[PDB]
Coordinates of C-alpha atoms and ligand atoms in Angstrom, one line a residue:
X6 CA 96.4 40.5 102.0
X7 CA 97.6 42.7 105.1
X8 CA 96.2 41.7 108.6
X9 CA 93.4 43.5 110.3
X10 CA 93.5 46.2 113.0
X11 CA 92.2 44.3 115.5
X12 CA 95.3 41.9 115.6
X13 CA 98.1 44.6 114.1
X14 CA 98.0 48.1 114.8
X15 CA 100.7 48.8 111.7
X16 CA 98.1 47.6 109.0
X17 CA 95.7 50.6 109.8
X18 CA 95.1 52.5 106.3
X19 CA 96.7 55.7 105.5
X20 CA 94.6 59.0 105.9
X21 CA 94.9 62.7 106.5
X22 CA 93.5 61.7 110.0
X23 CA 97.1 59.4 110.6
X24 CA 99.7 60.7 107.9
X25 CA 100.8 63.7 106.5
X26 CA 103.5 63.8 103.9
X27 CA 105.1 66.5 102.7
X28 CA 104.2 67.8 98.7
X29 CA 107.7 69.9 98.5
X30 CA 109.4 67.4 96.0
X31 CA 109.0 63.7 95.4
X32 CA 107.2 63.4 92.3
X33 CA 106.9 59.9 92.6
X34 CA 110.4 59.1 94.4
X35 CA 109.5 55.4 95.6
X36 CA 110.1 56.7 98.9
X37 CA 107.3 60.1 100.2
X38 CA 108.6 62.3 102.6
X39 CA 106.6 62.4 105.9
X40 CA 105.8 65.7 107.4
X41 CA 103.5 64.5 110.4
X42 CA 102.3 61.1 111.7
X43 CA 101.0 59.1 114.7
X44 CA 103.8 57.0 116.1
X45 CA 102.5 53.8 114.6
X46 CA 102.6 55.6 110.9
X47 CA 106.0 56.6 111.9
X48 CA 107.2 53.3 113.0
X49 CA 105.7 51.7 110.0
X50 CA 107.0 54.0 107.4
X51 CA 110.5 53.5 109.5
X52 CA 110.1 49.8 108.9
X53 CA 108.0 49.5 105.4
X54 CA 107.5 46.5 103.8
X55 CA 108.0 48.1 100.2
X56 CA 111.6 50.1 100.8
X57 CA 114.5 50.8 103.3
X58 CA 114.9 54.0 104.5
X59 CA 118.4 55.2 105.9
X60 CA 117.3 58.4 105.8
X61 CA 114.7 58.4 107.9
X62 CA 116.0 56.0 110.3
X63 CA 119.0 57.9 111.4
X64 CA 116.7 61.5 111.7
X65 CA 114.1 59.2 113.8
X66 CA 116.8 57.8 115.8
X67 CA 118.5 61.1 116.2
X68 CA 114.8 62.6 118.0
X69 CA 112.2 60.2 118.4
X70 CA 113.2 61.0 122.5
X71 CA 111.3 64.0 121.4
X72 CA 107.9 62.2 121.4
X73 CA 108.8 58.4 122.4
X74 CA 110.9 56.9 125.2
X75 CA 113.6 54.7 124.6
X76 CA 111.4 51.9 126.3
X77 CA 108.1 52.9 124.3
X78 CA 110.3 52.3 121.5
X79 CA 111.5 49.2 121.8
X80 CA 108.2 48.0 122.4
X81 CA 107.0 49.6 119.2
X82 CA 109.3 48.0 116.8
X83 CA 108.9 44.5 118.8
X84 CA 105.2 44.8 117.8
X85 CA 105.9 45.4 114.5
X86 CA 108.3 43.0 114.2
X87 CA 105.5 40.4 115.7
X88 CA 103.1 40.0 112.8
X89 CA 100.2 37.4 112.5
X90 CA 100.3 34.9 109.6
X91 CA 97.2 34.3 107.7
X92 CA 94.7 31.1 108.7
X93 CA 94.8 28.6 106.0
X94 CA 92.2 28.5 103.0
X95 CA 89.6 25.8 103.2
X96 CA 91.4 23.7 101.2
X97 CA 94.6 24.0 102.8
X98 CA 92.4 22.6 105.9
X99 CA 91.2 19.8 104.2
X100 CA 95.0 19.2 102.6
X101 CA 96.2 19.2 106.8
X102 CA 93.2 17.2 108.0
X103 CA 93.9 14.4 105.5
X104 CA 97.2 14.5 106.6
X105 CA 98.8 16.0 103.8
X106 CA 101.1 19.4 103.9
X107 CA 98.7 22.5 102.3
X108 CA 99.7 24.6 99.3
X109 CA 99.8 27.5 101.8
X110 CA 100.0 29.6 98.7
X111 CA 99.3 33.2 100.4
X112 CA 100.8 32.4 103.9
X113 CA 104.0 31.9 101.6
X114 CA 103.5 34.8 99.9
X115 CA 102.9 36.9 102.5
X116 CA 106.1 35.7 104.7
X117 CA 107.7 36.7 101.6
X118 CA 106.4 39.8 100.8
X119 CA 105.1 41.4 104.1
X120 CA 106.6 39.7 107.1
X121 CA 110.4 39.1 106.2
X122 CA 110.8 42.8 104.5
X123 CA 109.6 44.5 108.0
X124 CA 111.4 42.4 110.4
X125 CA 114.8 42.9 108.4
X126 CA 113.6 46.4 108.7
X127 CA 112.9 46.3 112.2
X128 CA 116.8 44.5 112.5
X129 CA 117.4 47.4 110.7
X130 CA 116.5 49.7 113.0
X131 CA 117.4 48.5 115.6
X132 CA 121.1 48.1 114.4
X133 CA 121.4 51.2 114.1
X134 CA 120.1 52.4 117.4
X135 CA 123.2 50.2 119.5
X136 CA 125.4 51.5 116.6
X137 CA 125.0 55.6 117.3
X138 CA 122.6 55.7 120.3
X139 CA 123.7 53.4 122.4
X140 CA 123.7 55.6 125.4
X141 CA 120.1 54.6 125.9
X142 CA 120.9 50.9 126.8
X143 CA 123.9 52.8 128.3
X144 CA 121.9 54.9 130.7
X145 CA 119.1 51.9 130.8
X146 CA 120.1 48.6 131.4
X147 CA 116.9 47.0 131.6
X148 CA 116.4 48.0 128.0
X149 CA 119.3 46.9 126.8
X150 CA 118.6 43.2 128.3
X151 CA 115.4 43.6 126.5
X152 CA 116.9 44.7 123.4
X153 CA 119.2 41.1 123.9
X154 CA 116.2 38.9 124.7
X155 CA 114.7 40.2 121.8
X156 CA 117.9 39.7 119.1
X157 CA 118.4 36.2 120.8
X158 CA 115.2 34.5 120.6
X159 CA 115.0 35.7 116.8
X160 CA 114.4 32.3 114.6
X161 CA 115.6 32.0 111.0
X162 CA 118.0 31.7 108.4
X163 CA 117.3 35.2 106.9
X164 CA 117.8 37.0 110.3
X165 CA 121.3 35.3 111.2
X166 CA 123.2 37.6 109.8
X167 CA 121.4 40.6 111.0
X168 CA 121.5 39.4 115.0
X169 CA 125.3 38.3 114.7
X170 CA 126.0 42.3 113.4
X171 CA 123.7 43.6 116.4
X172 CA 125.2 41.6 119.0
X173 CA 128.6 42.0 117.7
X174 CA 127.8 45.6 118.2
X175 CA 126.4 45.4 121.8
X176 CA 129.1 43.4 122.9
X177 CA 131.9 46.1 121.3
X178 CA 129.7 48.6 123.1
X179 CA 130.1 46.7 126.5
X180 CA 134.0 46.5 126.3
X181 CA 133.7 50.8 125.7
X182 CA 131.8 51.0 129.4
X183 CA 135.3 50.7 131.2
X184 CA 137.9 52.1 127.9
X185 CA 137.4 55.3 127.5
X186 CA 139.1 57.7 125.5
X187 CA 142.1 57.4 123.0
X188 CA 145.0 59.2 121.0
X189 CA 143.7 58.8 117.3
X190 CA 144.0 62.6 115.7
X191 CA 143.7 63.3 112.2
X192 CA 146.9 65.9 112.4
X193 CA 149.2 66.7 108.9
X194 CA 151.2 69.8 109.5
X195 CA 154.3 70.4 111.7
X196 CA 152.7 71.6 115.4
X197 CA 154.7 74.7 117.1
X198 CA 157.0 75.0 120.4
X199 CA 154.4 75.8 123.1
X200 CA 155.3 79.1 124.3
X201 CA 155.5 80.8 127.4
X202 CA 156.0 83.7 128.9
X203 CA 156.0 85.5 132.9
X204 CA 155.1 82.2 134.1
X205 CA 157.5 79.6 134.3
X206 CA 156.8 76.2 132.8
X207 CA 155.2 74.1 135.4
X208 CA 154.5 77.0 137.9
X209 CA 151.2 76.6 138.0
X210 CA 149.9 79.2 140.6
X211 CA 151.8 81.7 138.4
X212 CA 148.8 81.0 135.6
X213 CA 147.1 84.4 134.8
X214 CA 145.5 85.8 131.9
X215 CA 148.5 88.0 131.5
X216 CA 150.9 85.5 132.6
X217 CA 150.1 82.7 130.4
X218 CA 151.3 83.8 126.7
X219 CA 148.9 84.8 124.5
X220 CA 149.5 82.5 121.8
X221 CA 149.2 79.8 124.4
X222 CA 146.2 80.5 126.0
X223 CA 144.5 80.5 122.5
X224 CA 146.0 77.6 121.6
X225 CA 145.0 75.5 124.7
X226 CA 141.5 76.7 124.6
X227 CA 141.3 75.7 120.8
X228 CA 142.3 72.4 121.7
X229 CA 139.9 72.7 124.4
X230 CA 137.0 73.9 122.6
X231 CA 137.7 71.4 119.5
X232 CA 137.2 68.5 122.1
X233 CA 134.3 70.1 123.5
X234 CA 132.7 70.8 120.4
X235 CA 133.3 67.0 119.4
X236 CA 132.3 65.1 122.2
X237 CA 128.5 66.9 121.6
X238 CA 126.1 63.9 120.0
X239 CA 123.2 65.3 118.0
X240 CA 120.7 63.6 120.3
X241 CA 121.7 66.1 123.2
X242 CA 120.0 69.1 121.1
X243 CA 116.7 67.2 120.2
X244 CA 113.5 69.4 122.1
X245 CA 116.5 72.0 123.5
X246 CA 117.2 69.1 126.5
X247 CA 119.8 71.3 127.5
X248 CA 116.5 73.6 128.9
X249 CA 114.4 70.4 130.1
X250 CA 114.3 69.0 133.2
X251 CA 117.1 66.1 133.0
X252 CA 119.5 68.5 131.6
X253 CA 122.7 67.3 133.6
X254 CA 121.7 64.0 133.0
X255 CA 120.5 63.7 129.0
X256 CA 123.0 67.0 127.6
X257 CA 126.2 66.0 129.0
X258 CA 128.6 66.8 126.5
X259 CA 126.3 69.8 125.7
X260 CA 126.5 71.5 129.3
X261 CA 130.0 71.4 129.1
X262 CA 130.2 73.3 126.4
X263 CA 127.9 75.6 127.6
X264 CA 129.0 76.2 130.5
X265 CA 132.8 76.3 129.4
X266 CA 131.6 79.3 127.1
X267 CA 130.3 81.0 130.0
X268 CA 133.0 80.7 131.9
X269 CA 135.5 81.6 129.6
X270 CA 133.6 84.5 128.3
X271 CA 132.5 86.0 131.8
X272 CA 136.1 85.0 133.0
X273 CA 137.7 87.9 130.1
X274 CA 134.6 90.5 131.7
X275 CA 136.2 89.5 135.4
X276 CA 139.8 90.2 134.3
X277 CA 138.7 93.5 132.5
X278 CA 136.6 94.7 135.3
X279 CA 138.3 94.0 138.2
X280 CA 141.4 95.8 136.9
X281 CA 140.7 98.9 138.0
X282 CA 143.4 100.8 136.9
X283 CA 143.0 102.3 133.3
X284 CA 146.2 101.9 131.9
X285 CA 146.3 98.0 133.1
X286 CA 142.9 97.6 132.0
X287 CA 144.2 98.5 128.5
X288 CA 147.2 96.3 128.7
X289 CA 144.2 93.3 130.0
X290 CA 141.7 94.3 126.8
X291 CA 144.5 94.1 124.6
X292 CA 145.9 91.1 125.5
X293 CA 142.5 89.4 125.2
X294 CA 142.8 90.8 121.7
X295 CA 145.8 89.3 120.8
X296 CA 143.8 85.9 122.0
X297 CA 141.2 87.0 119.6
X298 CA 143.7 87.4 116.9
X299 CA 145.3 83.9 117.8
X300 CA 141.9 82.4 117.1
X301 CA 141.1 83.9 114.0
X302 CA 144.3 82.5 112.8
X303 CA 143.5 79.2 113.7
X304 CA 139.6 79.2 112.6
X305 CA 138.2 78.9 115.9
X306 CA 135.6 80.6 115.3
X307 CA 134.0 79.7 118.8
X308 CA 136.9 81.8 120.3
X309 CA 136.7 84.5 118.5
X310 CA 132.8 84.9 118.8
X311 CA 133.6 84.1 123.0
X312 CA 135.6 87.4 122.7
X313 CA 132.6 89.4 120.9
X314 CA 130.4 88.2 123.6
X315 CA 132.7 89.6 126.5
X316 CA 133.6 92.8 124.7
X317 CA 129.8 93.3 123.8
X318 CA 128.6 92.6 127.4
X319 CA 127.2 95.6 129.4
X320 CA 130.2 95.8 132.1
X321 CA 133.0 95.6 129.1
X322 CA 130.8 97.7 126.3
X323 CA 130.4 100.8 128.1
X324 CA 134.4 101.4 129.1
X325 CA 135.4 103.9 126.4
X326 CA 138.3 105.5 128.4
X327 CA 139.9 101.6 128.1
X328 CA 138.9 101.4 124.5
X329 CA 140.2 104.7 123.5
X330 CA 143.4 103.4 124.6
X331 CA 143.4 100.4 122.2
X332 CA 145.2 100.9 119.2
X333 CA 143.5 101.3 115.6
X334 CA 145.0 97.8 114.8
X335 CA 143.3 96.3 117.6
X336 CA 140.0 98.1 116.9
X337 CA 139.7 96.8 113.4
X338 CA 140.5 93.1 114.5
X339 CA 137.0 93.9 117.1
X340 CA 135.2 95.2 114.2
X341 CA 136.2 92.6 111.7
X342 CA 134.9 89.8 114.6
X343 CA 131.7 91.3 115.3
X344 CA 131.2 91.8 112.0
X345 CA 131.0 88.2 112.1
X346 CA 127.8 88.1 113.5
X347 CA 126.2 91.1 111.6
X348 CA 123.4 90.6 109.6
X349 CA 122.1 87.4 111.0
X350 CA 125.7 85.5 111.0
X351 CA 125.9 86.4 107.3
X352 CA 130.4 87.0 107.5
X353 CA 130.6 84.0 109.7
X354 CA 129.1 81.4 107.5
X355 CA 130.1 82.9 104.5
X356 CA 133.7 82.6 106.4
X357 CA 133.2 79.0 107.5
X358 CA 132.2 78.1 104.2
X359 CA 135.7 79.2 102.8
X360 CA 137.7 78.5 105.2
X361 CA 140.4 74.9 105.3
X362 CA 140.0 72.6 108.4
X363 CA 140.9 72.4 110.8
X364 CA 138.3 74.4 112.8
X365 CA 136.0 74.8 115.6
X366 CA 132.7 76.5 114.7
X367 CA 130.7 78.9 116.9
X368 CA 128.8 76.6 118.5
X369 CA 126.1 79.7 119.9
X370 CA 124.1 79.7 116.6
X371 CA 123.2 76.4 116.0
X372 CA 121.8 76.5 120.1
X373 CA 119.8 79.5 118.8
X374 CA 118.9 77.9 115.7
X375 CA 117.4 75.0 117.4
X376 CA 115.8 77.3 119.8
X377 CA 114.3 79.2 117.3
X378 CA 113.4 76.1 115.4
X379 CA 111.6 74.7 118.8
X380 CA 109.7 77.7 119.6
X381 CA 108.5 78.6 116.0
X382 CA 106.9 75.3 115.3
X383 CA 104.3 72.9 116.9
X384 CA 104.9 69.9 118.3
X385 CA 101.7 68.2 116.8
X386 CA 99.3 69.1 113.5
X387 CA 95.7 68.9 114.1
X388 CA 94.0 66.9 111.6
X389 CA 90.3 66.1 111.7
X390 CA 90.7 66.0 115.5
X391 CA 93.3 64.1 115.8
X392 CA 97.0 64.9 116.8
X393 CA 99.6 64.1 114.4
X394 CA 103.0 64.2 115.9
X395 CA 105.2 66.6 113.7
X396 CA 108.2 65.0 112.2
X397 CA 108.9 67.6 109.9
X398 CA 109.7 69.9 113.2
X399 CA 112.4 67.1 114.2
X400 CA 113.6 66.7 110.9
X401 CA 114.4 70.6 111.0
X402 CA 116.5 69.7 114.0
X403 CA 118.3 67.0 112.9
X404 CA 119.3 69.1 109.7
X405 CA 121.3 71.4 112.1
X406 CA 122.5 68.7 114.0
X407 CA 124.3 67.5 110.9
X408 CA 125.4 71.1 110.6
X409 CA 127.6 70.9 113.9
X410 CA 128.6 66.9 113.1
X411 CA 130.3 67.9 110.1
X412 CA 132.8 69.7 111.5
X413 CA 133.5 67.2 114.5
X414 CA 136.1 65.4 112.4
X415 CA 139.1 67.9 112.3
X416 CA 141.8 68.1 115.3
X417 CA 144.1 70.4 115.3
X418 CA 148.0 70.6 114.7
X419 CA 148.6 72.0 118.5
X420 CA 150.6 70.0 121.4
X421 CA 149.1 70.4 124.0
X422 CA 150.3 71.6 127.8
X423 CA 148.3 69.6 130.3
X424 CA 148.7 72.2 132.9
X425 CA 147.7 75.3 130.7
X426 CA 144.5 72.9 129.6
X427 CA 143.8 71.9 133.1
X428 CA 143.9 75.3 134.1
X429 CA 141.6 76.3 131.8
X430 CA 139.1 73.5 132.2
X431 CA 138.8 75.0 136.0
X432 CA 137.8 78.4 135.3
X433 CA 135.4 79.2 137.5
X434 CA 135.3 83.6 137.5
X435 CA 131.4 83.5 139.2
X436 CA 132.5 81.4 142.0
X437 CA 129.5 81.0 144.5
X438 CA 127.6 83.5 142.5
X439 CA 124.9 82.8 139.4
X440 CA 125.6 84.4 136.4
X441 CA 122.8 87.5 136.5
X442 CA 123.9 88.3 139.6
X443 CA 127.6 88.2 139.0
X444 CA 127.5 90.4 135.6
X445 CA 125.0 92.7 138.0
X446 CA 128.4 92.8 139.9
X447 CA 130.2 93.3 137.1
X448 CA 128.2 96.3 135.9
X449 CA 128.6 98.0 138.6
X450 CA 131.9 97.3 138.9
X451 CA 132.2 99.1 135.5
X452 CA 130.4 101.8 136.5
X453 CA 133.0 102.0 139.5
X454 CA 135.9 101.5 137.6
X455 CA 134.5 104.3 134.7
X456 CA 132.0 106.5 136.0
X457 CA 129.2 107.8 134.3
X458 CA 129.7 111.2 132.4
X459 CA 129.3 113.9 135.0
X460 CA 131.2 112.1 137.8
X461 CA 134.7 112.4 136.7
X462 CA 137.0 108.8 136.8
X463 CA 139.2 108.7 139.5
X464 CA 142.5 106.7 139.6
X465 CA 142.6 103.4 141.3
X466 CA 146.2 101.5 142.1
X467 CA 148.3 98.8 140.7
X468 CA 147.3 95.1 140.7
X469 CA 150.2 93.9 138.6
X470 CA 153.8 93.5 139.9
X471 CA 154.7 92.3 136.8
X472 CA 155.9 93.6 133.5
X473 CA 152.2 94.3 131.0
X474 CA 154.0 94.3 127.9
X475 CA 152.9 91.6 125.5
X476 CA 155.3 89.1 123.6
X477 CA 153.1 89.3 120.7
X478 CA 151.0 87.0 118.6
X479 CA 153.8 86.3 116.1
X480 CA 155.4 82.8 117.1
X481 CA 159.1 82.1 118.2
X482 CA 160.0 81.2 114.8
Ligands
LIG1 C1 134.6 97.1 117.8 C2 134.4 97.0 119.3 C3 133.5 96.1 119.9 C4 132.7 95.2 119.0 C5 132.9 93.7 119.5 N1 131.2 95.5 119.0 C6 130.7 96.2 117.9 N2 131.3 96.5 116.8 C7 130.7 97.0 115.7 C8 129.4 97.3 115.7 C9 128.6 97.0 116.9 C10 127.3 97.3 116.9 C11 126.4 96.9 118.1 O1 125.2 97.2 118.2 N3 127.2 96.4 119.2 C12 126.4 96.0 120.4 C13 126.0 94.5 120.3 C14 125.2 94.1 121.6 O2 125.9 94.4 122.8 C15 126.3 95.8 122.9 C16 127.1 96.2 121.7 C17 128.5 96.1 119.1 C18 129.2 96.4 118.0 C19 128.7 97.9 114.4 N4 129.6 97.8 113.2 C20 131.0 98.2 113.5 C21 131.6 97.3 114.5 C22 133.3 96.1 121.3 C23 134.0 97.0 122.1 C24 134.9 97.9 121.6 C25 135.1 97.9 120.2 C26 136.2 98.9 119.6 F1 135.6 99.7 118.7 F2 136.7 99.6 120.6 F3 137.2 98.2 119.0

């Protein structure tokens, strides 16, 4: 029936020593669920003869970079799609050399039932890879002219279709290479007046933390943050690539939002510190507040746990003459946000959950989900000697990838002010410094600013020659 090891590596038999499935659920589905594998079981369970598998497709195509390259992989599937065809019987031999056509009664069969079910599969597959992931042939352009010498020297009536969609989608692809982005915006509710406040509209080097209105600056960071958040693929967070070696080249979309969350949150620590007067300090933590307040109303979640993270830091944390000064009002709306995060996120989902879009999620926890998720599981199963490459790890991943990409669909009702968002998109508060050694600054900048308890605080001058009053976080309604 199926060909022989020696001329197909995908017709090796299933053992524990090649395949591991997994026995939670599946009591006789049709389809087993595969906990572990070698690559070859993997690719041939991607692209069995018996069933599709959409499933398991988009979860290997979302992390097989985790154990395969993109060229590896392409290679894989083209074997897979090349099977050998049987030799004819005897008779069939005797039917040709007489000059007659043979019966051919198995070759038949097994075009039939073997070879045209796994190359549709392999089409399959590798549909889906230009349709989601096509940032490999992006970044690689000698796979993607393999990936087109392949799907064009594909013969047969049964395949047509499947090539024209592929190529259809390759070529769509190409014409995105010099596009770019777009207005589309699901948007349903009446958007606000942008507001303002010291600084004049336009007046760009007037831009300030206490300048800006507060309303505004939460506004323009939630749209900020909600493209951030959506612009991450899943693929970016697949073996924590944002912590490998080709980070700024593989977790593009990811860094940025990384790196936007450090700079936003150690930009609100710079502001508090580096006011060194107490009673502007106050008027600085409280407006930061206000932010916080704006966020919550808008379900930015991201925000809101931003402002946790800089109140919670060790140069903020530790300035109880400031915090004294904030109001009970203002204390509660902390509280209430770091409650958030209290008892392993258990107020944030259960918030999230309840919540209407739109939203941006806090994008921390699914970083340290993965993370934790990486670290607490191998990257192969031993079996009889053998290494079996753990899928169900990947798999694990992939679940919290669908996590964030569920809540990638939902823009929000804001205009935005280009200036306020370019602002923003160029905060840079370390400057030439790195991080540890700028919040080591920090920290003893708080301790300059307040003292430890036996050294008394002294009082420091004026930065502001402006009015610190807020306008509030109720709009101009
Ligand atoms: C509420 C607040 C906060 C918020 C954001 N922090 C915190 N708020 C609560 C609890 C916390 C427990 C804790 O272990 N941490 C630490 C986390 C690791 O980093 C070092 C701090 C921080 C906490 C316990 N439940 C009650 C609410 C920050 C500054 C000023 C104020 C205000 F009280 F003045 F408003």
């Amino acid at each position: 029936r199926l060909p022989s090891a020696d001329v197909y590596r995908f017709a090796e038999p299933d053992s524990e020593e090649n395949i591991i499935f997994e026995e939670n659920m599946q009591p006789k589905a049709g389809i087993p669920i595969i906990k572990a594998g070698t690559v070859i079981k993997l690719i041939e369970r991607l692209t069995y003869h018996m069933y599709a598998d959409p499933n398991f497709v988009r979860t290997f195509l979302t992390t097989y970079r985790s154990f395969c390259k993109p060229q590896e992989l392409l290679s894989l599937i083209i074997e897979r799609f090349e099977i050998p065809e049987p030799e004819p019987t005897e008779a069939d031999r005797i039917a040709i050399e007489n000059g007659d056509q043979p019966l051919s009664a198995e070759l038949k069969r097994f075009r039939k039932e073997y070879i045209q079910p796994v190359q549709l599969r392999v089409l399959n597959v590798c549909r889906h890879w230009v349709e989601h992931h096509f940032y490999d042939f992006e970044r690689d352009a000698y796979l993607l002219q393999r990936m087109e010498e392949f799907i064009g020297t594909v013969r047969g009536k049964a395949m047509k279709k499947w090539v024209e969609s592929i190529t259809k989608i390759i070529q769509r692809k190409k014409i995105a290479r010099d596009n770019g982005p777009g207005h589309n915006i699901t948007f349903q509710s009446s958007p606000p007046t942008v507001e303002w406040h010291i600084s004049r509209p336009g007046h760009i080097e007037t831009f300030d933390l206490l300048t800006l209105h507060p309303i505004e600056i939460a506004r323009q960071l939630t749209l900020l943050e909600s493209d951030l958040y959506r612009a991450v693929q899943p693929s970016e967070l697949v073996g924590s690539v944002w912590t490998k070696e080709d980070k700024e080249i593989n977790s593009p979309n990811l860094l940025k939002m990384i790196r936007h969350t450090t700079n936003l949150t150690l930009w609100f620590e710079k502001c508090i510190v580096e006011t060194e007067n107490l009673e502007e300090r106050v008027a600085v933590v409280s407006r930061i507040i206000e932010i916080l307040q704006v966020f919550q109303e808008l379900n930015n979640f991201n925000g809101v746990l931003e402002v946790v993270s800089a109140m919670n830091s060790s140069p903020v944390y530790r300035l109880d003459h400031t915090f004294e000064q904030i109001p009970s009002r203002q204390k509660k709306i902390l509280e209430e946000a770091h409650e958030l995060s209290e008892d392993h996120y258990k107020k944030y989902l259960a918030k999230l959950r309840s919540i209407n879009p739109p939203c941006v999620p806090f994008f921390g926890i699914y970083l340290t989900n993965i993370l934790k998720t990486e670290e607490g599981n191998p990257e192969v199963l031993k079996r009889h000697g053998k290494e079996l490459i753990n899928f169900s790890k990947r798999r694990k991943v992939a679940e919290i990838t669908g996590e964030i990409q569920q809540y990638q669909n939902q823009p929000y009702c804001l205009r935005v002010e280009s200036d306020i968002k370019r602002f923003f998109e160029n905060l840079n508060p370390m400057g030439n410094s790195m991080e540890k050694e700028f919040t080591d600054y920090l920290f003893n900048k708080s301790l300059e600013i307040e003292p430890r308890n036996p050294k008394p605080l002294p009082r420091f001058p004026k930065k502001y020659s402006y009015p610190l009053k807020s306008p509030g976080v109720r709009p101009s309604n």
